[PDB]
Amino acid sequence: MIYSKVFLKLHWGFSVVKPLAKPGFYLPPPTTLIGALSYGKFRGVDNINLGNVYGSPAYNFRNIMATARLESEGVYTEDTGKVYIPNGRLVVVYVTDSISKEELEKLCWSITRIGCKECLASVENVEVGEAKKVSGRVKTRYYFRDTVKVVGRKEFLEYVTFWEENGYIWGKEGSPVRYILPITTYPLASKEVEVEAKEAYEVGGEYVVFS
Amino acid sequence: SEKENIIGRIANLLAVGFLYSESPTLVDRFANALSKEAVTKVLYDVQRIVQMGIDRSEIATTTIKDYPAVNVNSSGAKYTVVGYLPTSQDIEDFLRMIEEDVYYARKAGALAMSIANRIKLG
Amino acid sequence: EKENIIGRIANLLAVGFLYSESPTLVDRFANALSKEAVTKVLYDVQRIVQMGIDRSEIATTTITIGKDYPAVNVNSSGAKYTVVGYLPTSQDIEDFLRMIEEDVYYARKAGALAMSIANRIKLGSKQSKSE
Amino acid sequence: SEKENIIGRIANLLAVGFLYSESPTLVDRFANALSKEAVTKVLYDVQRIVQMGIDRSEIATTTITIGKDYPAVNVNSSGAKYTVVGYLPTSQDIEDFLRMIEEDVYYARKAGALAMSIANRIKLGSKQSKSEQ
Amino acid sequence: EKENIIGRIANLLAVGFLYSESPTLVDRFANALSKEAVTKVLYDVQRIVQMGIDRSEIATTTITIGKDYPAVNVNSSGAKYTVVGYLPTSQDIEDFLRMIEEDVYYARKAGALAMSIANRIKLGSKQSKSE
Amino acid sequence: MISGSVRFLVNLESLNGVESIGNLTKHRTAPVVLKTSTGYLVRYVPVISGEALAHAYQASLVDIAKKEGLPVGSLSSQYEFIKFSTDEALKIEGIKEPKDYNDARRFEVEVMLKDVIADVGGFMYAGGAPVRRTSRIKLGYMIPALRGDEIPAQLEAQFHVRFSNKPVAIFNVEVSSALYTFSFELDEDLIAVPSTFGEKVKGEEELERQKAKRVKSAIKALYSLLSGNFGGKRSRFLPSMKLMSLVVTKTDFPFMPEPAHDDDYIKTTIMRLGKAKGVLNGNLAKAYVINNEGIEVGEGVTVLSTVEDLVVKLEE
Amino acid sequence: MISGSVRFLVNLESLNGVESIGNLTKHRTAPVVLKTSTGYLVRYVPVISGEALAHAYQASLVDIAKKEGLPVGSLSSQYEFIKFSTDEALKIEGIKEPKDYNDARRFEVEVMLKDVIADVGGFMYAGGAPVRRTSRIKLGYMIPALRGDEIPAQLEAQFHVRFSNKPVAIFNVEVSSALYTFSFELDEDLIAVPSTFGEKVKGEEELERQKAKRVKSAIKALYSLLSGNFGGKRSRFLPSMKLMSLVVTKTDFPFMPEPAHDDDYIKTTIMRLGKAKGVLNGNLAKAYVINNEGIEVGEGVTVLSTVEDLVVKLEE
DNA sequence: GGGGCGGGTTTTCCTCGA
């Protein structure tokens, strides 16, 4: 199980609107993170024949684990929800085993935007390594699933709804999955939460929780 | 919660200035302020209007249990605003609240317009 | 000693305000963002107090509030005011300017105290005239 | 700083001249100066007043214990006795101060504000002692 | 070089004042509104200095203040004074007169410096006599 | 590809308005958080959206293309960039709708041949068989630099009156003056290339012949954006712009320069260009810098003087 | 197009006013961001709005059109430029409102054959079928030059009294002195040309006949702006104006001369004009320079003496 | 032998209208 870390510098922020008034999300979903990685290999093409229907040139990277977190302060504003965090820093962790270290590192440098066109984001540095699996009590900053238990004080937790990769195809809505975000609503920031969990990969001290 | 008492005293100052000048322009500027500059400029200009009314003896403190009030004479109309005017410390603490959140200027403006409207209707 | 200096500066600002009947110098002092603005007000208020001293309209006194307290009597426009406390020394002005060179917050603190002194005195004077 | 020491010695000269002459006019001119001409004219006129006080033995340098001895200037005016603590400026202090004024007239305002503070504190203390006696 | 010229003219005026015990030439110099008044003082002060030179009551010397500095010793009425610095050259007088033809301000600057030199020396001499 | 970061200085400007309240026209502002020794301060700062810049770029491209004889759509000849979105739009131009998924590519090519703006700008057709085309030019929001501990931007309200001889006439306008910075990306290599898998359809030879002219026109259209021909209210509130710093990078692989929010952002982007070329096995990497505020540049960069030379070098 | 940059020196000035406080009449002030050796600073400086300049230009155009026999609107005959915004103006002039979109062009022509002011300065009609016409002359705020570290501008208040034999009469007036600079643009290739897209409508032949006279009048109208006939309070506060530098560029392609903020803004704009003509495939580029302060100009540049010669050359 | 003294300002008005 290989892992990679990337540091991104945002220009003005990101904007992803909720499916189904156009409120937006607080942090990008894993689908956007996987699509940004896939942009490095599928550049120039917008429709691929999956075999039955044209849905996206991203239905092949669906099994790559990804998380992300903030490192600065921002504000969420509706004026079409937007998350303004100019000159901020984003840390993205990719955990997978499908490809070797070289391919993941090459695709990691090829991230251009997160969300829509205006949300450009440069790349400052990357790290690649081998991760270890643990199950003891850990402290994490990355968001995780709803079913994961919590031992600490419930004070900085929010509930959001994301979608699986089934939504990659047009004319079809993805499955609803609940997610827990350790975020302060105003001003925007990230806080540490202690969880027990069952699977946690150590990617340099900042344990990443998946289930 | 003295924050609400400070906002109420600022709203009384704005209402007295509006009733005396017969102009909403300072309250409009205060309620639309997006910077500490705009708020502070209105706080000076409204107090300068109130100072002229004090010097002319057209603005005076009174009691009306007895409640503190401000009598305002403008264009032969008599108005009475119930409450205290802000202290220098209230202005300073209010400016600190504005440096944290300009929302408090909108809250004071909404209260000031409500006071002035109720008095003009009566 | 920092609080005593701030209190003596606040007494000077309150005396200058009550004598001039103008809040403009206290407004400038409490809104100061530089040592220039603070120092300019410290001169201008002392210049107003100097005129009141030369006219014998500002004088130091003692008042029994059963011990004698130092006070400053101010006569303005036929109104009589009494501020309780001392005026700042030259050393208090110099030490206060050094405090301002470290943190302009102390000008806001002195301005807030000065306005409180002046407001309490003006309220008491208006009440006695109404009775 | 040496600039602050120069300004403080100029302020002592202005305060001595004010207490001896009983006139604020030279300090007012100094603090309102917008040119090197006005500053230099006051520096001459105040030193000319101090020179008369020296010749009359009404202005003298002394030391005072405030437990170490501090330099001071005694001033006798109209039967009042005043003591200003500190040194008077040297010729080099006047020349360096005039160079500071040629760069920024702000230093004349700073010296004037200090001089008026010294004079006010001394006048207040002298009036209080007369009221007690 | 303009400041050095003004400083040397101020030394000449201070030597002439200390030797004659009269401020009249320095007063005339500092109040000058024309090149005529300035030039007349420059002659009259040098004529006084010339008499002091002929009497050996004015002499150039060096003094250690740990390096040697140029100075002028002046003996007047049994008092001894020492002015530190050079006297002006003929070229300094000519360049100074050209500066005066542009702006008479330089006469006031030299007069203010000369009076400062003389006052400091007179104060020091009176203090040593009192001790 | 081409990437650019540009720094601007604008005075007494009102280009991007927002919803009007009462008798007042308001400017577009966004919140920022500034760090102080005491703590944090939230401040509202004027901004300019990325849609007005796209509109100006598309209008300039239309104007340049109509001079060289390149095809232009009927509704795009008029400055109305609805593009081939719904059936009503296709009816005016005269294009049959796509039949099924397998024919989709063909439709694209037809559209790609009947309107240049639909190619470079990109288009989306909603329906039973949607077709997509991502824009070849990417622009970002114009936000003044958050440098140091002070924000160099202001926003005031101005009062205006109309004169009439029979009173029975008052409005307010918000004006600003800031120090703006913005970045952009363009891919001249993908111009005149379809973006759908399948088999080649008759008519691609015309696109191959027109590729060079389309690329030249697309590069030329950047001059209007870099010269300051965007926004509105230019009849009575014409602004006063000026160029301070500019960095443009031309490579053969994805790359972007650092945001122009710091005082030293050219040395960093040059070092990162070298490092990225080291890892991505690139061949071409060139940087052009225009400097007017006297900030540190570095070594290994050609220094220009104007924007016209930049366009000439990019075209060459 | 004709694009110009002009520098003026004005002393003891008050032509533009704002809301008054007490017995004090205030002068318009705006924030400006200026660059010094220590960084960037924000200052408050008196300015003059461009609407006064537009009003003066339109009044001069009205006078010239009336003198030369060109049609002038009834409401525009009096110096009240409400144009055709409201229904009362339409009723007074006697023009029927547009019925649908297809009739809009006709309405525009009816407005365009009656008042030259509507043709040149544009107009707006709001309703079921809104009609828009952008102005053909573009101006901006008048800002003093932001050269060096010190702004060459000053503002003060003055005291005035009214005499009376029976006291029962005191006011203050703000007066400023500065070195102003401003730029203007005028595209004469679109004068007397309809802007709304549609079919041919009877009456365009008259517009084609009168196009030359309309262009000549529009060019002539710039003399008032270039001379100094603008602003209010001229009865008792007549200002002292003196031209210092002027650059005028005539091109067949879009172009913008450098603002008159730096001492060297003529050589730069001439070089930029040459390079822009080279790169944009133009066919006409001429420059005229009037200099009275002895600053660098360049080589191969026509030098004039007054403004009337420039106006004659532009007309010819 | 390096001057002295008496004077350091009094009224009147502090915006009108859409």
Tab-separated table of C-alpha atoms (C1' of nucleotides) in Angstrom, chain G residues 23 168 170-171, chain H residues 12-15:
chain	number	residue	atom	x	y	z
G	23	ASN	CA	-22.028	76.220	6.303
G	168	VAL	CA	-29.835	89.137	13.006
G	170	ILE	CA	-21.194	83.498	7.010
G	171	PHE	CA	-20.105	80.568	4.845
H	12	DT	C1'	-22.407	90.573	14.902
H	13	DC	C1'	-23.819	86.614	11.938
H	14	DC	C1'	-22.663	79.770	12.504
H	15	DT	C1'	-27.424	78.440	5.728
